[PDB]
Amino acid sequence: GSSGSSGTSSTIFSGVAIYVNGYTDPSAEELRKLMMLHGGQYHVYYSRSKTTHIIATNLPNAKIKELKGEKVIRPEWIVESIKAGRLLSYIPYQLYT
DSSP states (O other): OOOSOOSOOOOTTTTOEEEEOSSOSSOHHHHHHHHHHTTOEEOSSOOSSSOOEEEOSOOOTTHHHHTSSSOOBOTHHHHHHHHHTSOOOSGGGBSOO
């Protein structure tokens, strides 16, 4: 099973699982598809094995304690990368690093 012309053949997000937590822009639903369409993976629940990164805009002092070590990138790192059509950097997109 396969389609003729998918649209934008780009594997800039190959094997890249993301997990939106809390309020984010765009919304989680948006990033949910943008991923699959860009060869990405979406997880409803937070996984330490499946999910590779943690998408989020802001986290409470408490949460920052439960995510001491992981890489929380802003929801803008993907949006921008898509709009440009190429994978961008994440360093500057790291909230608490």
